[PDB]
């Protein structure tokens, strides 16, 4: 008996560094990469320990198909209380009342969440209209429904609400979507509502890129005008990877809102199985923390940092789409320096700087890069720190011009050159040195 | 002021869960306790080892990895790539597959998600599929495609492969699916292949319920006959919650599945993968390839025969009159009990089960589904299951007794449950029993 | 007078006869009129129409566009065309013993296919499920735009297996269940099919194309006693003009929902204006259906089919189901080692038109489909069919003889003595019988 | 024998006027209506006798499922030769060569034809874009995704810039020009440039201009479009039905055209059954006649007649959409006279004048119900010339003068209006003038 009891404990309580050294080594190398590098991907962020402790818990052991108080399986009395608590905290986070709004927190991702709304509200093939980043059908939404997307004014970079109104009145989509893409300026949610109303569409906002700013009233509030708001749990909110759906409830021929039953059912049982109980606990923790002054200050600093960085790059002759930002992210046009994002991205990578090329405009040039403050803001960077980072971003560009010039016609021989360049190796060292000056949550 | 804000980050980032969120921590602890102090007979459920939790609750959740290894949307994936690549190698090794004949996508958020990616990848919306059914349109598969399911023979409880051949030749579905439901007997995958080939259908297996038995060659091998196998990562395999897709590659001119499925998963249907889940999966798959694991499965099946034998001896009725695997369908209608109520009384006695659909020929609500994987993991053996059997009967004897006296009203019933001495006595016997067995990962 | 000169130029053009206005076409039309008279017609579809019908077709009615429904037209000037369509409708109900309070009828459909598709389009959302009989990648537009799970006859018996149908329908739960359709040589148990439809909650539709004649004359099962919708072709049994027609139930069962949906599907969804000339022609044909003469025409048609069946059985031939309840025969040639594909082409050379058909293998290419209506119309009687049976055998005996060498026999075909001899016998036979409208 | 052979002849040869008097009476009443009225519906025309003789023939007797030389049934030796001849005449009518263009002549209607093209080329649900005449109505919009475009509301002309913008956005598989009754020429060349930019197949529905196109009296869509569909019975004075022209042989991946097999198959067996052999013969006759100088001179007069009518109405202070026409039809705005088409239409009917109210964009950017559509082809066919149309203009105004007068006195009820209509002196007087006018003109095929 006691022999078997020890056999279980042996296996069950064996640490990762013993149970799987090969993985453990890779995890440690990746932890080091994270610490010794700058993170400028506007998506990315760093989570606190408590969120990781929630993820890495016995909650993964319990299958909980269904909703709180209406599960497929017995034993969910404590998982219900967690999900419920997670819900309550989601409303309070966005200053919502339970009589006017409900929320489903099971969606495996933001993509997943959006598609559930469409699945729930629409018959297959019905029409939707949302923003777009400039076989041939890519998103599942565009496969299983009829997506006619809209785009930003190619000259201004801003949204043209007038063309949008024309377009929407003509296409009469069942669902109109705002948010979605990485847009560096505030939305006129009020306006989009007027449009939605005119063409008899349901207004949805995908607030993934602004979840942080919305909760902290540091941008326009879509909850004031949309019938549905989806989001990512892990960007602004520094929660775990997943999605979430807010919908209206109770009164507005239609007497009351019809959303809750349809959406809940679409998530489960239509599209998903059980939820990730561990993700939900993690999410509740993250959402408790969003409702704090500490988090408000975090977002405020995030935005000050973004202006600091914008100002820095304009001072250095750079071209920003719209000439700046209202929020936490920058679209930087490199074509005036004669660079594509594709290559600048890959040089920055060699120098421990992570960013990502983006689509920019009146043809579609491959010469944009997308940058955001949240990650380094989380590591305690302030306005002067971002002024430093700017210098690194310019040195990287100066190198990139210099290398394209010497290697004018080498597709293979260019990637090799990278690994033995002295100016890269110098900048990489400056970046690692810089990076180590800032703390890294949960070590 | 620099060192003061470097401590404010550390303060927040390194705060343990029991401080950061006591309300959540208390619930997490109550659930850990529940798991320890009860019997788990849900055939889905299992308990994961610590290393798997440590993977989940890690800095890997910080990095967004949209795309595939070597072909990501974002820079910085050098180490995540090596982990995903390792997780893939281990998945093949686990199921005795060679990389030139098979490939595997490990990103699917769930087994449901995985199946749906297969359909989305291979078929045009509205095209036809056929699979088993557990006795409006409910599944997303049946919403966006044409599902004509097949069923087990209502008298036998076994599958009728002749009626299946008839139905498949008539409907000529693009994809024919075996596995799926909790079926207590072995599949004739060889036969189903003959049928697929006749009606020109791609043969897919959903090996969610038998993932374990398949890897250990302790049941029929669907990889010997199917072109695609999907599965859940977290049932047999004691990995993290998610799904996985195996597909054939190279010469049969060649297979057409890899590009189509990978693309469906991303970018069509999902965003970025759960890097934490993927590491945790790699660890779980390393452990499947061990003798310990093969012995684990062997014991799991011995325990199932032990439990079947015990119940038959006690005049119970089992669908098909036993099992070839790890699970049991128990018909309670001969004792005059519905699964709905027996389920809820077992819950009150710390026994977790779930009512199931079974044929009586009408569908009776008097089935319940039991499996051995969970208690087998905790180091239970044949004689322990014989003890558990005694509890299952004492629970049934109480349920009959209660239905009789207080079955008149659902309210008057639930009251008697909360305040019954025989329940409380058997609950104590179960907790006492339960605590004798280890519980993997007690911090 | 430049006025009068113009007035003449118009009359000159407008009254020029076909034989002057287009000799090339006229010559081909004359050659075809000859072919029709000097041949035997055993295609079970085909029939010959009366002069009055042709006069309606070739009239000023083709000049007036009438988009819409009677008394609800898009265009002015329809006062008389309305009276014609309304009359055609009343005559269609009368023909099939229906009352206007319980049934309505749309007579605009350009064809029977067009008519079936309008019902589907009218009642169903694209992609919803239908089930109908099939003659043993996606071909029909019904199977393209909707989800068609077809059923088939029992391969051994050649009769319909209503038990297997019930099982298949309860499984597939189609929004619409369809009976009739294919050329089936036995009566339908419409009563049974209803029972099934009702069980799987489907709308019962009958395609009465093949049997339109028999049904009107109560010389077979009446689908109007059991179906909610009956479609048909106007030009088979009925000896009307080419087109289709839709009957649907109206008023209480709360009330039927078919009329507005189906009318709208036909127009404006699927077609434009109706062929006013075809409708008048149809009205004429339907007045004539309602007569004892027509009943006697159908009676003879069936006696003629039994006469032919009997004649071929006596001659060792194999008929699917071993006969017929109606006007058409499925003849299995595989016991004589022949494919339809070839027999068909030989019969053609001998001025005998019939058509190869799908039949089940004990799935063989060795069936041909034969019917009485065409020759029955020309005044053929039982003994005349017994003569035709001889011709059919002599055609077969020739076909076996020529399949000795094998493609290569195309020369032999053109220059064969036995063919020429039988062709002459058939032309001589054919010229004995009148040909409506000369 | 001979007694049964006479019983068939008795039935088979019975003339219509004996076989069915009730129908015959109505048919005769309608023939009279056609003769004793003015036809200004731009669609309508009158066919010659030869065409009627084709329609009302033994050809209806033969079922010809399939295509020439590839039929389902035997006995089609001659039917084939007719269809083949109809096809050759269709090509020669529009100046096309068989190596570069093919044509399917089975479509039961022009609607039917358009839908076959869509069915043939596109998967259900794929995208098309076409013009619209100001719930899902057309089957095209039910079974496929139709995002239509419209004329500039102020100008009444098409806005090719807004059309380019819209097409590049929506990227439809098939872009369609023609369609509506449009009184001005199309810039097919321009529409081609657009199609090419958004990678769409360019289709023209030439139903309303079939006549002008054949006679090179308007822009030629065959010079630019990959597919041209049409109605057989409007300009061409053929029988009612449709027809599909598609390109053949050589034109990134696309080496040769892929249209013929897909379209033919969509027509049959997908959508239709057998063709109307009698319609096809009639069509062949009609198309022979289109390729003559007589027919060219017909179209020429048709257009001179239109200018004559436009000029006439302008001179009497009428308001025309786009201020005139390049073709055979006229959109007339009545809102300056305070009239709706819906009522003017119904008064004109009473006076033996057939036209039809039409959707127009008004002086306001709104959609007024105040338009009517008029054309010359029908009365042109009956031998009317310019001065005759100036007469018909006088009738149209008198009718309007009456309609205002009536709306003023008897507007109170729709029942008290329809009475006044039946029993009005000024109507009766104008009805007489119109009948008297109409009988001056020949009516083709009055035997």
Swiss-Prot record, chain D:
Pathway the protein acts in: One-carbon metabolism; tetrahydrofolate interconversion
Q: Give GO terms for biological process.
A: glycine biosynthetic process from serine; response to cadmium ion; S-adenosylmethionine metabolic process; sulfate ion homeostasis; tetrahydrofolate interconversion
Arranged from A to Z, the UniProt key words for this protein are: Cytoplasm, One-carbon metabolism, Pyridoxal phosphate, Transferase
List the subcellular locations: Cytoplasm
What reaction is this protein's catalytic activity?
A: (6R)-5,10-methylene-5,6,7,8-tetrahydrofolate + glycine + H2O = (6S)-5,6,7,8-tetrahydrofolate + L-serine
Q: Which cofactor does it need?
A: pyridoxal 5'-phosphate
Q: Name one GO cellular component term.
A: cytoplasm
Write out the function statement from the record: Catalyzes the interconversion of serine and glycine.
Which family, according to the similarity comment? Belongs to the SHMT family.
Instruction: Please state what the protein is called.
Output: Serine hydroxymethyltransferase 7
Q: Which organism is it from?
A: Arabidopsis thaliana
User: Which lineage ranks, top first, belong to the organism behind this chain?
Assistant: Eukaryota, Viridiplantae, Streptophyta, Embryophyta, Tracheophyta
Q: Which gene encodes it?
A: SHM7
């Amino acid at each position: 008996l006691e022999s078997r009891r020890a056999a279980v404990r042996a296996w069950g309580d064996q640490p990762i560094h013993l149970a799987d050294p090969d993985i453990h080594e890779l995890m440690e190398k990746e932890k080091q990469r994270q610490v010794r590098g700058i993170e400028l991907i506007a998506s990315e962020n760093f989570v606190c320990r408590a969120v990781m402790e929630a993820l890495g818990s016995h909650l993964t052991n319990k299958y909980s198909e269904g909703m709180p108080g209406a599960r497929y399986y017995t034993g969910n009395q404590y998982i219900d209380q967690i999900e419920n608590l997670c819900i309550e905290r989601a409303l309070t986070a966005f200053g919502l009342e339970s009589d006017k709004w409900g929320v489903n927190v099971q969606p495996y991702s933001c993509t997943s969440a959006n598609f559930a709304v469409y699945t729930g509200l629409l018959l297959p093939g019905e029409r939707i209209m949302g923003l777009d980043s400039p076989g041939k059908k890519i998103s599942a939404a565009s496969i299983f429904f009829e997506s006619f997307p809209y785009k930003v004014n190619p000259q201004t970079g801003y949204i043209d609400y007038d063309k949008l109104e024309d377009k929407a009145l003509d296409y009469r989509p069942k669902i109109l979507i705002c948010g979605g893409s990485s847009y560096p300026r505030d939305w006129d949610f009020a306006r989009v509502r007027q449009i939605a109303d005119k063409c008899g569409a349901v207004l949805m906002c995908d607030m993934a890129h602004i979840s942080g700013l919305v909760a902290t009233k540091e941008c326009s509030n879509p909850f004031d005008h949309c019938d549905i708001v989806t989001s990512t749990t892990h960007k602004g909110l520094r929660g775990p990877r997943g999605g979430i759906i807010f919908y209206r409830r109770g009164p507005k021929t239609s007497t009351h809102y019809d959303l809750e039953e349809k959406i809940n059912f679409a998530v489960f049982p239509s599209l998903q199985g059980g939820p990730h109980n561990n993700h939900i606990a993690a999410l509740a923790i993250a959402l408790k923390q969003v409702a704090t002054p500490e988090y408000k200050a975090y977002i405020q600093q995030m935005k000050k940092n973004a202006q600091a960085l914008a100002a820095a790059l304009l001072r250095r002759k750079c071209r920003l789409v719209t000439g700046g930002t209202d929020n936490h992210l920058l679209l930087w046009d490199l074509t005036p320096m004669g660079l594509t994002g594709k290559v600048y991205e890959k040089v920055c990578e060699m120098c421990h700087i992570t960013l990502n090329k983006t689509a920019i405009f009146g043809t579609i040039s491959p010469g944009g890069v997308r940058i955001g403050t949240p990650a380094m803001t989380t590591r305690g960077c302030i306005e002067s720190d971002f002024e430093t980072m700017a210098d690194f971003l310019i040195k990287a560009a100066q190198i990139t011009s210099a290398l394209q010039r010497e290697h004018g016609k080498s597709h293979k021989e260019f990637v090799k050159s990278l690994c033995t360049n002295k100016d890269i190796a110098e900048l990489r060292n400056r970046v690692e040195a810089f990076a180590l000056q800032y703390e890294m949550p949960a070590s």
